[PDB]
Amino acid sequence: DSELQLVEQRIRSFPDFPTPGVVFRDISPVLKDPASFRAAIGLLARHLKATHGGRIDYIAGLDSRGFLFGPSLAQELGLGCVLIRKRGKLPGPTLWASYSLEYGKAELEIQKDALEPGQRVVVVDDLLATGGTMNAACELLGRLQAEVLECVSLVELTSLKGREKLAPVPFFSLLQYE
Amino acid sequence: DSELQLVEQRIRSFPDFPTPGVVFRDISPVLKDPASFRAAIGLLARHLKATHGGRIDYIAGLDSRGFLFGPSLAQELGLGCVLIRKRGKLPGPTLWASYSAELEIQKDALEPGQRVVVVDDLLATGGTMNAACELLGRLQAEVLECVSLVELTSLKGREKLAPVPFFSLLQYE
Ligand SMILES: Nc1ncnc2c1ncn2[C@@H]1O[C@H](COP(=O)(O)O)[C@@H](O)[C@H]1O
Ligand SMILES: Nc1ncnc2c1ncn2[C@@H]1O[C@H](COP(=O)(O)O)[C@@H](O)[C@H]1O
């Protein structure tokens, strides 16, 4: 797939960041090359349309790098984009969920009126690692009685078994690295 | 203008958030309504093309709410988007700038002389946009303009960025 190649060629890998042994996957060059960004959004949108048809109501973008892809993906599908944020950033009534991040805890948050019961959503972030962040997003959405059809990312680190963590919610990534 | 109205109708205000005194302007509904989002991006893109012609090389999006608009604005203009992030998030060699918190940019994000337009959701004191402009200036990039959806005029952020031009879709005190 030439389109997938346009994305893969623009992932930059940095060893030992932020800690020794970790390989950081930097999607910045995908954003910087308009053809690469367009290819990434197009591949995600084709997959989602082919898989879910007209069932998707909204895209949910995850703070902060998911924000880079959510609105463009939503626009390509003709849908709105709702936001899941780090706790403390959103006004009005919210729900929040705690999860493990590195050595400590972090918290995600969503406005109670972001979705109504029965609405169907697809969550997007740039990269799936342990799956902790995506799992918390799924939990929050479930508490609004929204149905999470799928989670998607550009990159998946398969050795961390994020896919299994999200089951039985389906997951799809453009690219995979150990 | 019906397009500008599509955006204005989707800004929600919250008094006394996050602390007493502050009136929070929430752009979330703009993102949730695909028509409103398209209108916002279109209005910004039309302004930038009419003002700069073909001179813009890149859009720079500011962490984190500027990330919601940067890539779509860049795409509409046929340009790439570079990222300015909260410090500690980017790999490789970086530069950073404080302001009353720290922003950061990769040393290789831009080449000297490249022309950039910075975007964020809202301009208030201008501290955040000013730090972004400083970082870009240290890469020897030329900042053509800064833009946002919302500007709080009583806080005089526009004066803070001068002489760099600024444009907002909507203004509140
Ligand atoms: N190796 C990596 N390279 C870049 N980002 C990563 C990496 N590992 C985790 N992340 C980020 O951390 C969050 C996901 O981590 P996790 O909750 O473990 O799936 C997302 O915001 C990812 O962007
Ligand atoms: N009243 C406000 N409502 C929503 N966001 C705000 C408000 N004031 C400041 N901000 C955010 O803070 C940054 C602008 O602050 P400043 O650096 O004072 O211009 C931007 O990232 C805005 O998203």
Side-chain angles (χ1 to χ4, degrees), chain A residues 63 65 86 98-108 125 129-134 136, chain B residues 89:
Chain A
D63 200 351
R65 284 181 259 149
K86 296 302 161 57
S98 183
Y99 62 110
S100 294
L101 180 68
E102 305 184 20
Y103 291 85
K105 301 133 169 294
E107 296 179 300
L108 288 182
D125 203 355
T130 65
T133 303
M134 225 149 226
Chain B
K89 297 293 167 52

mmCIF file of all heavy atoms in Angstrom, chain A residues 63 65 86 98-108 125 129-134 136, chain B residues 89:
data_model
loop_
_atom_site.group_PDB
_atom_site.id
_atom_site.type_symbol
_atom_site.label_atom_id
_atom_site.label_comp_id
_atom_site.label_asym_id
_atom_site.label_seq_id
_atom_site.Cartn_x
_atom_site.Cartn_y
_atom_site.Cartn_z
ATOM 1 N N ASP A 63 -6.852 13.513 24.502
ATOM 2 C CA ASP A 63 -5.829 14.490 24.886
ATOM 3 C C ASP A 63 -4.501 13.752 25.066
ATOM 4 O O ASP A 63 -4.480 12.752 25.775
ATOM 5 C CB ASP A 63 -6.267 15.076 26.243
ATOM 6 C CG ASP A 63 -5.620 16.411 26.580
ATOM 7 O OD1 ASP A 63 -4.688 16.851 25.874
ATOM 8 O OD2 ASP A 63 -6.074 17.033 27.572
ATOM 9 N N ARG A 65 -2.310 14.057 21.934
ATOM 10 C CA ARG A 65 -1.947 13.750 20.549
ATOM 11 C C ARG A 65 -3.103 13.181 19.717
ATOM 12 O O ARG A 65 -3.073 13.230 18.489
ATOM 13 C CB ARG A 65 -0.712 12.850 20.490
ATOM 14 C CG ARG A 65 0.598 13.578 20.776
ATOM 15 C CD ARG A 65 1.789 12.630 20.687
ATOM 16 N NE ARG A 65 2.255 12.211 22.007
ATOM 17 C CZ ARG A 65 2.822 11.040 22.278
ATOM 18 N NH1 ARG A 65 2.882 10.088 21.355
ATOM 19 N NH2 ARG A 65 3.239 10.788 23.511
ATOM 20 N N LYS A 86 -7.382 15.499 29.978
ATOM 21 C CA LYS A 86 -6.746 15.365 31.283
ATOM 22 C C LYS A 86 -7.647 16.059 32.288
ATOM 23 O O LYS A 86 -8.224 17.106 31.991
ATOM 24 C CB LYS A 86 -5.366 16.034 31.277
ATOM 25 C CG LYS A 86 -4.384 15.382 30.320
ATOM 26 C CD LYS A 86 -4.190 13.912 30.655
ATOM 27 C CE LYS A 86 -3.611 13.144 29.478
ATOM 28 N NZ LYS A 86 -2.315 13.724 29.031
ATOM 29 N N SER A 98 -9.581 7.246 36.843
ATOM 30 C CA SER A 98 -8.168 7.153 37.157
ATOM 31 C C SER A 98 -7.580 5.928 36.484
ATOM 32 O O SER A 98 -8.267 4.924 36.287
ATOM 33 C CB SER A 98 -7.971 7.054 38.672
ATOM 34 O OG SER A 98 -6.594 7.027 39.003
ATOM 35 N N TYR A 99 -6.313 6.033 36.102
ATOM 36 C CA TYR A 99 -5.596 4.914 35.502
ATOM 37 C C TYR A 99 -4.111 5.013 35.843
ATOM 38 O O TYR A 99 -3.645 6.034 36.366
ATOM 39 C CB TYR A 99 -5.813 4.867 33.978
ATOM 40 C CG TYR A 99 -5.304 6.077 33.225
ATOM 41 C CD1 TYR A 99 -4.194 5.985 32.393
ATOM 42 C CD2 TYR A 99 -5.944 7.308 33.334
ATOM 43 C CE1 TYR A 99 -3.728 7.092 31.695
ATOM 44 C CE2 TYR A 99 -5.477 8.421 32.650
ATOM 45 C CZ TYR A 99 -4.373 8.305 31.828
ATOM 46 O OH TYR A 99 -3.902 9.405 31.150
ATOM 47 N N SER A 100 -3.385 3.925 35.599
ATOM 48 C CA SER A 100 -1.948 3.881 35.844
ATOM 49 C C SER A 100 -1.204 4.467 34.654
ATOM 50 O O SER A 100 -1.492 4.133 33.503
ATOM 51 C CB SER A 100 -1.479 2.437 36.065
ATOM 52 O OG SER A 100 -2.017 1.889 37.258
ATOM 53 N N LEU A 101 -0.249 5.345 34.935
ATOM 54 C CA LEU A 101 0.580 5.918 33.884
ATOM 55 C C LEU A 101 2.006 6.000 34.395
ATOM 56 O O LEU A 101 2.279 6.661 35.402
ATOM 57 C CB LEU A 101 0.067 7.303 33.479
ATOM 58 C CG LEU A 101 0.877 8.001 32.379
ATOM 59 C CD1 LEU A 101 0.734 7.284 31.042
ATOM 60 C CD2 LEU A 101 0.449 9.455 32.258
ATOM 61 N N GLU A 102 2.908 5.292 33.722
ATOM 62 C CA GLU A 102 4.282 5.190 34.182
ATOM 63 C C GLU A 102 4.260 4.737 35.632
ATOM 64 O O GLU A 102 3.547 3.798 35.969
ATOM 65 C CB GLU A 102 5.000 6.531 34.037
ATOM 66 C CG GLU A 102 4.942 7.096 32.629
ATOM 67 C CD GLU A 102 5.745 8.369 32.488
ATOM 68 O OE1 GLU A 102 6.629 8.608 33.338
ATOM 69 O OE2 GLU A 102 5.495 9.125 31.527
ATOM 70 N N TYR A 103 4.976 5.446 36.500
ATOM 71 C CA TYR A 103 5.105 5.035 37.901
ATOM 72 C C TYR A 103 3.963 5.509 38.795
ATOM 73 O O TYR A 103 3.870 5.103 39.956
ATOM 74 C CB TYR A 103 6.424 5.542 38.476
ATOM 75 C CG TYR A 103 7.628 4.853 37.895
ATOM 76 C CD1 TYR A 103 8.188 5.284 36.701
ATOM 77 C CD2 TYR A 103 8.192 3.757 38.527
ATOM 78 C CE1 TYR A 103 9.286 4.646 36.156
ATOM 79 C CE2 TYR A 103 9.292 3.115 37.994
ATOM 80 C CZ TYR A 103 9.834 3.563 36.809
ATOM 81 O OH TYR A 103 10.921 2.926 36.266
ATOM 82 N N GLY A 104 3.083 6.344 38.256
ATOM 83 C CA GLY A 104 2.025 6.924 39.065
ATOM 84 C C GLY A 104 0.645 6.767 38.466
ATOM 85 O O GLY A 104 0.372 5.816 37.729
ATOM 86 N N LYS A 105 -0.232 7.700 38.813
ATOM 87 C CA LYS A 105 -1.594 7.701 38.309
ATOM 88 C C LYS A 105 -1.844 8.983 37.535
ATOM 89 O O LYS A 105 -1.180 9.990 37.758
ATOM 90 C CB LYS A 105 -2.576 7.620 39.474
ATOM 91 C CG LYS A 105 -2.397 6.388 40.343
ATOM 92 C CD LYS A 105 -2.408 6.760 41.818
ATOM 93 C CE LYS A 105 -2.503 5.532 42.706
ATOM 94 N NZ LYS A 105 -3.812 4.847 42.530
ATOM 95 N N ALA A 106 -2.775 8.921 36.589
ATOM 96 C CA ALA A 106 -3.258 10.113 35.904
ATOM 97 C C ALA A 106 -4.777 10.014 35.842
ATOM 98 O O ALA A 106 -5.354 8.986 36.199
ATOM 99 C CB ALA A 106 -2.664 10.223 34.507
ATOM 100 N N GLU A 107 -5.436 11.096 35.445
ATOM 101 C CA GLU A 107 -6.882 11.076 35.368
ATOM 102 C C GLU A 107 -7.375 11.701 34.077
ATOM 103 O O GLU A 107 -6.855 12.724 33.636
ATOM 104 C CB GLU A 107 -7.498 11.794 36.563
ATOM 105 C CG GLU A 107 -7.205 11.128 37.896
ATOM 106 C CD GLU A 107 -7.813 11.885 39.056
ATOM 107 O OE1 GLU A 107 -7.457 13.069 39.237
ATOM 108 O OE2 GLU A 107 -8.686 11.316 39.745
ATOM 109 N N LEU A 108 -8.329 11.021 33.448
ATOM 110 C CA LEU A 108 -9.020 11.535 32.273
ATOM 111 C C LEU A 108 -10.434 11.972 32.666
ATOM 112 O O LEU A 108 -10.995 11.502 33.657
ATOM 113 C CB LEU A 108 -9.078 10.473 31.170
ATOM 114 C CG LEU A 108 -7.760 10.173 30.446
ATOM 115 C CD1 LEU A 108 -7.992 9.148 29.347
ATOM 116 C CD2 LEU A 108 -7.147 11.439 29.871
ATOM 117 N N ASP A 125 -6.461 7.769 19.174
ATOM 118 C CA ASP A 125 -5.244 8.347 19.752
ATOM 119 C C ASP A 125 -4.121 8.063 18.751
ATOM 120 O O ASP A 125 -4.305 7.299 17.795
ATOM 121 C CB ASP A 125 -4.953 7.698 21.113
ATOM 122 C CG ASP A 125 -4.086 8.571 22.029
ATOM 123 O OD1 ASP A 125 -3.611 9.652 21.609
ATOM 124 O OD2 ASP A 125 -3.871 8.147 23.189
ATOM 125 N N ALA A 129 -0.086 1.682 23.524
ATOM 126 C CA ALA A 129 1.041 1.011 24.171
ATOM 127 C C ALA A 129 0.466 -0.015 25.142
ATOM 128 O O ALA A 129 -0.075 -1.019 24.690
ATOM 129 C CB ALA A 129 1.940 2.019 24.866
ATOM 130 N N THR A 130 0.448 0.275 26.448
ATOM 131 C CA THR A 130 -0.158 -0.666 27.405
ATOM 132 C C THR A 130 -1.671 -0.715 27.259
ATOM 133 O O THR A 130 -2.324 -1.677 27.665
ATOM 134 C CB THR A 130 0.154 -0.322 28.878
ATOM 135 O OG1 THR A 130 -0.447 0.929 29.233
ATOM 136 C CG2 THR A 130 1.652 -0.254 29.121
ATOM 137 N N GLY A 131 -2.247 0.348 26.713
ATOM 138 C CA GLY A 131 -3.686 0.397 26.556
ATOM 139 C C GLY A 131 -4.399 1.018 27.738
ATOM 140 O O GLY A 131 -5.613 1.164 27.718
ATOM 141 N N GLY A 132 -3.642 1.410 28.754
ATOM 142 C CA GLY A 132 -4.221 2.041 29.935
ATOM 143 C C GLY A 132 -5.031 3.290 29.606
ATOM 144 O O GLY A 132 -6.127 3.478 30.135
ATOM 145 N N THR A 133 -4.480 4.151 28.753
ATOM 146 C CA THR A 133 -5.131 5.414 28.399
ATOM 147 C C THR A 133 -6.421 5.171 27.610
ATOM 148 O O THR A 133 -7.468 5.739 27.923
ATOM 149 C CB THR A 133 -4.188 6.321 27.580
ATOM 150 O OG1 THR A 133 -2.977 6.560 28.314
ATOM 151 C CG2 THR A 133 -4.850 7.657 27.266
ATOM 152 N N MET A 134 -6.356 4.286 26.623
ATOM 153 C CA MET A 134 -7.520 3.966 25.814
ATOM 154 C C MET A 134 -8.586 3.255 26.639
ATOM 155 O O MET A 134 -9.792 3.463 26.443
ATOM 156 C CB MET A 134 -7.098 3.088 24.628
ATOM 157 C CG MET A 134 -7.697 3.492 23.295
ATOM 158 S SD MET A 134 -6.570 3.091 21.938
ATOM 159 C CE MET A 134 -6.611 4.596 20.982
ATOM 160 N N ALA A 136 -9.169 3.616 29.893
ATOM 161 C CA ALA A 136 -9.832 4.639 30.704
ATOM 162 C C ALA A 136 -10.835 5.450 29.870
ATOM 163 O O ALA A 136 -11.938 5.755 30.333
ATOM 164 C CB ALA A 136 -8.809 5.566 31.326
ATOM 165 N N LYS B 89 7.672 16.591 26.532
ATOM 166 C CA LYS B 89 6.901 15.678 25.688
ATOM 167 C C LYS B 89 7.575 15.275 24.372
ATOM 168 O O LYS B 89 7.209 14.261 23.761
ATOM 169 C CB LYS B 89 5.548 16.314 25.365
ATOM 170 C CG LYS B 89 4.677 16.564 26.589
ATOM 171 C CD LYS B 89 4.240 15.257 27.226
ATOM 172 C CE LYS B 89 3.657 15.476 28.613
ATOM 173 N NZ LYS B 89 2.579 16.502 28.610
#
